[PDB]
Ligand binder design. Structure first.
Ligand SMILES: O=C(O)COCCN1CCN([C@@H](c2ccccc2)c2ccc(Cl)cc2)CC1
Ligand SMILES: O=C(O)COCCN1CCN([C@H](c2ccccc2)c2ccc(Cl)cc2)CC1
Ligand SMILES: [Cl-]
Ligand SMILES: [Cl-]
Ligand SMILES: [Cl-]
Ligand SMILES: [Cl-]
Length: 580
């Protein structure tokens, strides 16, 4: 009868209110926290009224009708969100579709800076307001953040403050926990954004494929029917959360967690620990669960997929099913491959069949299909071993620098902050992945690279600057990483004309945190590449070394500014000659 009552009843007031605040914060990213609280309280009041009597007027309205109506009441909607006011002239589902089209992925809001004393003060003063504000701040900064996961992270955030405010030293307890929390927020936001991107740009089939591969790796003991069930249910969960239907997404996600845990013996031995936890914890634990051991009875795949005489008939009859089973089977056997590698392998299997089945003697043609995968496997494996070597040789900062040079050459039209961000993000991937046991390096590296490349692609939709990026971001998802890897110096670029102030430093650099100091230097690096795009990476590193020496020296000087002013122009002029 009443959907709003149904969800209120299923989720309870706490989670209902939390998720509604998330939904609204994500749709309306600029309003103050206090204004969103009021919309949430009103919506909740109405849900309670409807729960008491579902036949009361408007109670039987859809959630989109009710929530879209609520959003469209907000003060200063024309002035703050000119685009969203336009959406408010439409009915559902056109209105919601309009709301979705107009979410902002890079709202450029100030960085969230921990103030241990004033925050612990606010936490004690009003814990509920303090935690809601956390939901709001993160939600408006990550408009596709997986709703229920944000409630999970809010409870961690709560645990951090409960542990660390009563202690003697606040900042020493807190700042490591909050820095770790922030990193987990970023990773999580990137994973989910890839999911929503994949729905948006490649459709539901791509999400399902991705998911078949990854879930088969994690749960290799499960049969194709179980994996398919879970994939079907999890795809629906992510489709709902990506479309802003957070209440339905949360309810369906809880049902999925329940199902997995009731069938854990047939799904995976690694689920036991997850399944003895509370709800949000349980879902999160399942989501991050480690891959199960390979079962000793995994089937030989040649008979069914290369040697059977009727593969063309079975392929022709039920393409999406035959290929799905292939993907399930190959993936469960290959936790050592990345998901995109498995998707490339599946596409090569398909293409081999389309070719062989239109020739005279298909069996003799498709008998070698598995051997077609060999080159697909070896390229990424070599690329990872190669980059983990550079990483172990030079350490994180220089690895970052090398990637900055590499990506700036590929796409020098991209903004310097974005180029630095991606280079820095991919350098951190080396830190994480290269330290792992070697068989895990490939999936770790390539799965994380996908997240960073997707971030680049998302930015590029909003701020297009390069046709080569556009092609890599919009041709097949499986080929995205190879496409980016195959880009070379955009020769079409006209070297950015020299501006000396771009390479001019001052003494304020000396007061910066180390990371911020590095970002300054890395920004200069990217700018050096834009002005001298044919310079070798070794020329660029030599010049960057001189910039570092100069900053370290002038920051150690008695008269820092006099140092920077006398030495800066020399360095700048010298560096042009060094980059020829
Ligand atoms: O749709 C087209 O553009 C032309 O038709 C190609 C149809 N194939 C079907 C198989 N499909 C892959 C595929 C999709 C997305 C990324 C890689 C492979 C797939 C494998 C297993 C599963 Cl369960 C679902 C889909 C790729 C496209
Ligand atoms: O007043 C009482 O008797 C004690 O009840 C407090 C109930 N609160 C309501 C606000 N809830 C906030 C909240 C604050 C502001 C807006 C929406 C929800 C919330 C914070 C974190 C998560 Cl994970 C979920 C909910 C928490 C529970
Ligand atoms: Cl996001
Ligand atoms: Cl689709
Ligand atoms: Cl994972
Ligand atoms: Cl160095």
């Amino acid at each position: 009868k009443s959907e709003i009552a149904h969800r209120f009843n299923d989720l309870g007031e706490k989670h209902f209110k939390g998720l509604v605040l998330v939904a609204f914060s994500q749709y309306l990213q600029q309003c103050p926290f206090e204004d969103h609280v009021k919309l949430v309280n009103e919506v909740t009041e109405f849900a309670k009224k409807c729960a008491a009597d579902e036949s009361a007027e408007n109670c039987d309205k859809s959630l989109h009708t009710l929530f879209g109506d609520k959003l469209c009441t907000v003060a200063t909607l024309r002035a703050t969100y000119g685009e969203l006011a336009d959406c408010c002239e439409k009915q559902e589902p056109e209105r919601n579709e309009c709301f979705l089209t107009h979410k902002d992925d890079h709202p450029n809001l100030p960085k969230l800076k921990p103030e241990p004393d004033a925050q612990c003060a606010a936490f004690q003063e009003d814990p509920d307001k303090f935690l809601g504000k956390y939901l709001y701040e993160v939600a408006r900064r990550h408009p596709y953040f997986y709703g229920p996961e944000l409630l999970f992270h809010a409870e961690e955030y709560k645990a951090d403050f409960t542990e660390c405010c009563p202690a003697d030293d606040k900042l020493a307890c807190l700042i490591p926990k909050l820095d770790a929390l922030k990193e987990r927020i970023l990773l999580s936001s990137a994973k989910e954004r890839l999911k929503c991107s994949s729905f948006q740009n490649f459709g539901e089939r791509a999400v399902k494929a991705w998911s078949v591969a990854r879930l088969s790796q994690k749960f290799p003991k499960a049969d194709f029917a179980e994996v398919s069930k879970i994939v079907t249910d999890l795809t629906k969960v992510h489709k709902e959360c990506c479309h802003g239907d957070l209440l339905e997404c949360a309810d369906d996600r809880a049902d999925l967690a329940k199902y997995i845990c009731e069938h854990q013996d047939s799904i995976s031995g690694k689920l036991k620990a997850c399944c003895d936890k509370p709800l949000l914890q349980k879902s999160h634990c399942i989501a991050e669960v480690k891959e199960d051991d390979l079962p000793s009875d995994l089937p030989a795949l040649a008979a069914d997929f290369a040697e059977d005489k009727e593969i063309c008939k079975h392929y022709k009859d039920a393409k999406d099913v035959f290929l799905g089973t292939f993907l399930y089977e190959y993936s469960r056997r290959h936790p050592d491959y990345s998901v995109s590698l498995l998707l490339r392998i599946a596409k090569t299997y398909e293409a081999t069949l389309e070719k062989c089945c239109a020739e005279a003697d298909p069996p003799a043609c498709y008998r070698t299909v598995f051997d077609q995968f060999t080159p697909l496997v070896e390229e990424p494996k070599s690329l990872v071993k190669k980059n983990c070597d550079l990483f172990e040789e030079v350490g994180e900062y220089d690895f970052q620098n090398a990637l900055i040079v590499r990506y700036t050459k590929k796409a020098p039209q991209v903004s310097t902050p974005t180029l630095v961000e991606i280079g820095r993000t991919l350098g951190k991937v080396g830190s994480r992945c290269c330290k792992l046991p070697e068989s895990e390096r490939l999936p770790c590296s390539e799965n994380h690279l996908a997240l960073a490349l997707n971030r680049l692609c998302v930015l590029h939709e909003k701020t297009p600057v390069s046709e080569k990026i556009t092609k890599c971001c919009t041709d097949s998802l499986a080929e995205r990483r190879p496409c980016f890897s195959a880009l070379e110096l955009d020769e079409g670029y006209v070297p950015k004309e020299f501006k000396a102030e771009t390479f001019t430093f001052h003494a304020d650099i000396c007061t910066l945190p180390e990371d911020e100091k590095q970002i300054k230097k890395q920004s200069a690096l990217a700018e050096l590449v834009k002005h001298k795009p044919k310079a070798t990476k070794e020329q660029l590193k030599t010049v960057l070394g001189n910039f570092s020496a100069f900053v370290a020296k002038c920051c150690g000087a008695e008269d820092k500014e006099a140092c920077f002013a006398e030495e800066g122009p020399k360095l700048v002029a010298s560096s042009q000659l060094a980059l020829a």
